[PDB]
Each structure stands twice: as structure tokens, then as C-alpha cells.
Write a protein that binds this DNA or RNA. Structure first.
Lengths: 60, 76, 48, 58
RNA sequence: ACUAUUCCAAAAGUUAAACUUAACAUGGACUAGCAAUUUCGGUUGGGGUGACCUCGGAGUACAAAAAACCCUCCGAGUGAUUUUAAUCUAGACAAACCAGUCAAAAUAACCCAUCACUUAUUGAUCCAAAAU
RNA sequence: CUGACCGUGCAAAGGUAGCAUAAUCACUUGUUCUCCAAAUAAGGACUUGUAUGAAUGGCCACACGAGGGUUUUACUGUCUCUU
RNA sequence: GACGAGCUACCCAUGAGCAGUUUAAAAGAACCAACUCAUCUAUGUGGCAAAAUAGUGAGAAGACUUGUAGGUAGAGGUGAAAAGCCUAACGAGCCUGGUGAUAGCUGGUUGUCCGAGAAAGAAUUUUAGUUCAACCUUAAAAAUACCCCAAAAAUUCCA
């Protein structure tokens, strides 16, 4: 049987409809010069593009 | 061999996104420009990057005025 | 002179802001800033 | 659990680095005892630490 | 790993009511001389040498975009003065991926801005730390 | 013309004997002399030795060499020039 | 992991060989046959021969030549030291096994008919390779799209 890639499983979330969800990058460091709004919107989630979502789907 | 040195700068695609007569929506980008080529008119907001946008739903219209200003208006 | 990165801490004991200062300056930065917890402006002092 | 124990050796004892197998052999010394049952003096080259247990086994 | 050391242990002695010695063999770390594994960029009017590698602005690139050359001018990895950017709901620009801009309006509490021509002036993962 | 001598900078100390266009000299086919009717080679000297040097030795040296070069004589199908 | 010093390199043990001539005592010097080497020239160039033959040349009592019995091997040995030799090619032998090592390269990939039909956007220890756009193809649906004049800012838009 196939082995799913854990690298995808940890940081991505698949819904029942097949929609993929990921966290916005850039919040980790160097926030001193960054606007609070930027960080605020980087703390939220975002849906992956269908092309890449399919690739992540094949790995799950 | 070349003493002089310079880099290349990717374009930010400055210009006018919408045209007169077109039906736009509130919050839509009208014209992205450097400094002021044109000025904001009625129902049109100004940005920090000097990019004009539409305040409310309506139609874009360009109007020139001489007292030498160019205003963009949105008519609901 | 140099550049020193510090934080602005309310008397509540938790810094809500992070800013910079000149190394030429010595005395800690003391500035009024809005506090979201108590929901009002409080005096903030410079901390590491 | 002493004779011929072959382990692995590391530098900082945290390895992102090379791991090199290392050999370990027990210490050998002479221990003279006396068996009254067999009426014979015996010589054991066996494990040192084990003798400490034998002393507690009497 | 091998050839020589510094210490604590194995093995022996010493005093008072905690300290000194190494003949053979064998250990734990440790200090030197020996040995063991690989790496050895790209762009390039061949290669090497030299130069260059990311970013911003003004021409090449005539009235919305974008567009190269080892074409051509200047600028940055910041500098300083005062007030201070609190929470989130629409809707758009740009965009292969990833990173970047504008923002009506609602609520809580008051009632960002100037220079370095205007913009530049930075860094995506995993791993560490003043402490959450 | 040259500089026994003097002054000065620098360095740990600044090439002594001897040798030298050399298995070393770029300029170079250095200049002069010998050798030849003609000598970028060879030999003998001169020395501004690009870039000799005293045990990675320096300078010479009888004898020795299937080593590397130069000049007369002798003798030859090497050659004129082949049969 | 093993096989190899019957080739060759060195060494151990045990044997053998090296005319003649001039000469003062001289296994002493020089010349010169055997034997041991391969200086030059020529021939030979799928050969007589995968190291030759002919002329010539060196050593030839010495650090000499040679028989037999032995020793030293590849994370090495040996080497009067050339990066040489170790069974005709050694910058590190050969055999077997790992092994169908790895090759983004190069050389290759077989019957018929029909429809449609590609030459460059940014990145990459990247340029002879990849990942999604710029295209394309199959099978279905919901839309509409273009050539686009004057209202306006070669075009960007729209009857």
C-alpha cells in the first residue's frame, strides 16, 4: 500500500468536500517593522490552489 | 570588464484598471499611478500609493476642469 | 551611534509593543500608548 | 553481559555528525578464592563487579 | 583507530578523633604528533583571470502594461525628529507557486506624520533564547 | 664619465671569497677578441648578475664517459650526380 | 571475501660459471671470445616475433652471471627512486560476490485508417534537467465572445 507524506499531513487540512486549508506564512519572525494588520491577516488561514491542492490530495 | 553596475526593477504595472462607461463595484481599483497624473473626484477615494478607488457602486466617468485638474467620478 | 531594539511595556507587566531607539540616547523611552486589555491609554516604559 | 560488547561512538553525544562503531571489552584480573566443599583453592579471572555480588551472596 | 601525556578510578600504605604511592595487565574522559571521510558555485561572444549575483529610481523600452545585452546614469542593506498605528467586516489591484498594495463600513477607547527629489532600505523552512 | 668618501630611509641582518650573457641574461644575435672567404652556435674577456653564490654547497681539478657542444687533418656514392 | 613472487622486484638457503694477450709480486691494470646487456642505423609494421632480425656498440674478477630449494601482495609489498614492478595495458593487480552499482548522456524502440494539432512566463548549486503559467487534447455543461465607430484615457475600452 502507498505511504502518505507526513510533511503534507501536518501543515495541511483536508475537508470532506476535498478542499485544502493551510496557514499563512510570514508570521514567524521579523514582525517589528510589519504592520499589525499584516500579522493579523497572516494569523488566519487560506485555501490552497486547485492545482497544488490536487498534488497534496494525491499525497493523502 | 564593466565598471558600471545596475540592477533591473520588476514592473508594478501602474496604469488605469477601469475605463469610462464601465460598471464597477464599491472597493474596486480604478487607477494605479505614481504621484498624481489625475485627481480623485466625487465618490472616489485616495490611497497612500496615490491609487484612486470607487467608494460606492456606480459608473466611472472622466471629467477635466480648468481654474488644471482631472477628476474621476462614480455615478450610482 | 547604533540602533537598539526594545519593547514598550505597560505597568500591567506585559509589553504590547516593540520599537527602536538610538544608542546615543540613554534614558529609557517613556511614552503613552493604548492598552487593549484595560481598553484605554496607559503609560508605557522601555523594557528589553 | 560484558565480554565482547560492540557499540557506537559519537563526538558531542548528539549526532548530526559521523557515527563510528567502537569496541568494548571487560577488565580482567586474578581473584583467588577457597572452596571447602571441593577442598580446593580456585582462581577466577572472571568479572570484577560480579565478585561484589558474590560477596553479598554468601 | 595507532605512538606518547593530565586526572579520577582498580590495586597498596599513612595519621587523627581527613591524605599520600604505582612494578605487570586493564578502564572513563582529556591534550599533542599521526591517520579517516568528502566538498571544490553560476552568469560568461570558449574557459581561466577580472567583473557580476538580492532590491529601488531615471533612459534604452515616443500618448494603458510588459520587454534583453559583459547597454547607460544614480542610489540601499539604513539615518533622524515628534506623535503613535487598538480590535475586524465588505470589496479590488498585482500575481505560475510563494511573497506584495488600496480600503468604504461596524464596534471599543480618543477626538501614523516630516525629512534623505517622491518611492528603496530586505530573507521563505526547520532548529535556539529573554519567557510565554 | 665614474663615486674611494659622506649624508639619509628601512630591516632580524642587507651577498664576504670565488664566479659570471653561465644547464642561469628578458632586452639579446650585449660589446670586444679568436676561429671561418661569411660564425644567432663555439672558445677567450669585459660586468647594469631582468632572474649566480659558498654542504638543495661555492670555485677548480688528473683520469674516466655507447652523455651534451665547437674547430683542423685523414678518408669516403654523403653530395655535385648518378651509373 | 579470496586467488597470485613457475613472469618480474628484493632477499634467504644451497650449487655452478666467467678463453686468450702485454706485463714489475699482484683474482692487480687495458684489450678481446663465451655469458650478461640493447648505443646508433636499417629491416620487419595483421610480422619470423603481441619486443624480432642484421651490422654496430657496453660490461665481461665484479656493485658479475646463473640453476635449484624458500620468503615478502592490493586500507599493500618491493623499488642503487622512473610514479617502476607485483603473470604480455598497475596513479595502484586479478577472480568472485555486492550488482541488473550509478548514468540529467549517447546510441535504439516493430501493423492500418481517421480528426485535431505545439518553437519560449518567471524560478532552480539551474542552462544538455525539472516545477506550475503560455499553449494543446479527451469527455460534459453553463455561457456568451470576438472583428469593435463617435461618448473618453500606437493602443487601452465599448455600440
Amino acid at each position: 500500500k502507498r505511504k502518505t507524506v507526513k510533511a503534507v499531513i501536518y501543515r495541511f487540512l483536508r475537508l470532506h468536500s476535498g478542499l485544502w486549508l493551510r496557514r499563512k506564512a510570514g508570521y514567524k519572525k521579523k514582525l517589528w517593522k510589519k504592520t499589525a494588520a499584516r500579522k493579523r491577516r497572516l494569523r488566519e488561514f487560506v485555501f490552497c490552489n486547485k492545482t497544488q491542492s490536487k498534488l497534496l490530495d494525491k499525497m493523502t | 570588464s564593466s565598471k558600471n553596475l545596475g540592477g533591473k526593477s520588476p514592473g508594478k504595472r501602474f496604469g488605469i484598471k477601469k475605463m469610462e462607461g464601465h460598471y464597477v463595484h464599491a472597493g474596486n481599483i480604478l487607477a494605479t499611478q505614481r504621484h498624481f497624473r489625475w485627481h480623485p473626484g466625487a465618490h472616489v477615494g485616495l490611497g497612500k500609493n496615490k491609487c484612486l478607488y470607487a467608494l460606492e457602486e456606480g459608473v466611472v466617468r472622466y471629467t477635466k476642469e480648468v481654474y488644471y485638474k482631472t477628476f474621476v467620478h462614480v455615478v450610482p | 551611534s547604533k540602533t537598539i531594539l526594545v519593547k514598550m511595556m505597560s505597568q500591567a507587566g506585559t509589553g504590547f509593543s516593540f520599537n527602536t531607539k538610538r544608542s546615543r540616547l540613554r534614558e529609557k523611552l517613556t511614552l503613552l500608548h493604548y492598552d487593549p486589555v484595560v481598553k484605554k491609554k496607559v503609560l508605557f516604559v522601555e523594557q528589553k | 553481559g560484558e565480554g565482547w560488547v560492540l557499540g557506537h561512538r559519537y563526538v558531542n553525544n548528539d549526532k548530526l555528525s559521523k557515527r563510528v562503531r567502537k569496541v568494548w571489552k571487560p577488565q580482567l584480573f586474578q581473584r583467588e578464592l577457597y572452596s571447602e566443599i571441593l577442598d580446593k583453592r580456585f582462581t577466577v579471572t572472571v568479572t570484577m563487579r560480579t565478585l561484589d555480588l558474590i560477596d553479598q551472596a554468601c
